[PDB]
């Protein structure tokens, strides 16, 4: 039994399994271990047949004894959380889960942390230093940070990005340790909890006069913010509880093509709610059109939905139809 180091034995296994299998095994490996095994498969010596046999036998024993589970370890998170709490809370918990694994260097903290504060941090740095830090981060973070710098500095930084020639190892090590010291402050984790889709939800609740004054002030402050808030106010779900008479009235105002495009993204309950109210011929032709026309872009579907939401708002302002949160109980 020669002194066969386990890293070299793993190199033996990687060589023996095959190229596709070697890449598949690699894909579940961390970068540092990848480089360690890379140095091993670089300075790899020849292995005798008997040592080969011993390594493969003990590896087969280990695989047989420890092979189990590892079914959906990562996507199990997303599927459980989505089916449990819905997409938004699933994403929140998933982001917390993926941030639980800490960085090793403050560079990745810069990636994980807010682009505005990152721009504040890096604005005074040397433009080459800015380039070096920016290339390291995830591309979305770098783009967001560059969106915050003024035109001239952003110009110099991008040009340095393109004409990058190579940072020295001691230089990058010192930069990394400086960033680690600067970001050594315990946790940033700016709690995203709350904001839009809660503002509109709250405005949905209080007195009509109060909420209309609030939305008027929000429109005065920022028209786009008010429009987003109003789109969240209505939501394309209460159209099934805004009962039958509203459906009959809105049919008299909705164009057939707009209704057809909107109903493609509508839920089957909402489609049935709209269909069952009008004439049999109209319902049949609408259902046939929905089943026959090809897929339509979500942007167009939401455009038609927003147009008919404008129609609903205009008719509710006239008072022909009632939009009430309280369900109409029937006896």
């Amino acid at each position: 039994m020669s002194n066969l180091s386990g890293t070299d034995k793993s190199v033996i296994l990687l060589m023996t399994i095959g190229e596709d299998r070697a890449a598949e095994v690699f894909k579940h490996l961390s970068t540092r271990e990848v480089q360690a095994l890379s140095t091993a498969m670089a300075n790899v010596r020849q292995i005798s047949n008997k040592q080969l046999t011993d390594v493969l036998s003990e590896f087969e024993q280990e695989a047989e004894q420890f092979a189990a589970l590892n079914i959906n370890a990562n996507e199990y998170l997303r599927s459980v959380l989505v089916k449990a709490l819905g997409e938004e809370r699933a994403s929140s918990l998933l982001e917390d889960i993926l941030e639980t694994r800490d960085t090793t260097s403050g560079i990745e903290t810069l990636n994980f942390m807010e682009p505005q504060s990152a721009a504040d941090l890096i604005r005074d740095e040397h433009p080459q230093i800015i380039a070096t830090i920016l290339v390291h981060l995830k591309r979305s973070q770098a783009a967001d940070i560059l969106a915050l710098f003024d035109e001239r500095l952003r110009h110099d930084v991008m040009l340095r990005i393109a004409t990058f020639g190579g940072v020295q190892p001691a230089a990058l090590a010192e930069l990394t340790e400086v960033l680690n010291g600067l970001l050594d402050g315990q946790n940033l984790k700016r709690s995203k909890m709350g904001g839009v889709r809660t503002a509109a939800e709250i405005i949905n609740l209080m007195k009509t006069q109060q909420e209309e004054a609030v939305i008027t002030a929000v429109r005065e402050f920022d028209g786009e913010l008010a429009q987003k808030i109003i789109d969240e106010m209505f939501l394309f779900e209460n159209l099934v509880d805004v009962d039958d008479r509203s459906i009959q009235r809105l049919l008299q105002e909705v164009d057939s093509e707009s209704l057809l495009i909107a109903l493609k993204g509508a839920e089957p309950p909402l489609r049935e709610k709209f269909l069952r109210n009008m004439s049999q011929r109209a319902a049949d032709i609408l259902r046939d059109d929905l089943a026959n026309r090809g897929p339509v872009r979500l942007s167009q579907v939401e455009n038609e939905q927003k147009a008919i939401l404008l129609i609903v708002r205009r008719l509710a302002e006239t008072g022909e139809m009632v939009i009430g949160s309280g369900e109409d109980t029937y006896v």
Binding site: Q128, L159, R160, T163, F164, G165
Partner: protein
């Protein structure tokens, strides 16, 4: 105490060369403080300069040179008892390719 003056152009060129920049880009010195990474670069070439200066002096008089601290403004230093005190300055113009910089050595005449 003596002083080593590292110019913004020199520090800019040094950092540019060190951190991937080939230096072909025009030098844009608008006036700003040196960051911690820039401070480390300053520390490195300052250590090299002090070692070279000690080596140069050793041929005539051996002495020990020790770094004290760094400053950004001349009011921070006040190297002399009075501003009218006579002092020695030695400039050096360093050229690398097309990039020019300066650095100075300031020693009081009392030294």
């Amino acid at each position: 105490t003596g002083l080593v003056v590292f110019s913004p152009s020199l520090v800019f060129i040094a950092v540019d060369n060190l951190f991937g920049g080939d230096g072909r880009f025009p030098t844009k010195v608008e006036g700003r403080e040196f960051t911690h990474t820039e401070q480390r670069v300053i520390n490195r070439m300052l250590k090299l300069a002090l070692e070279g200066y000690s080596d140069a002096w050793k041929a005539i008089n051996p002495l020990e040179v020790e770094y004290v601290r760094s400053e950004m403004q001349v009011k921070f230093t006040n190297i002399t008892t009075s501003p009218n005190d006579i002092v020695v300055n030695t400039p050096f113009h360093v050229e690398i390719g097309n990039l020019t910089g300066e650095f100075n050595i300031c020693l009081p005449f009392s030294m």
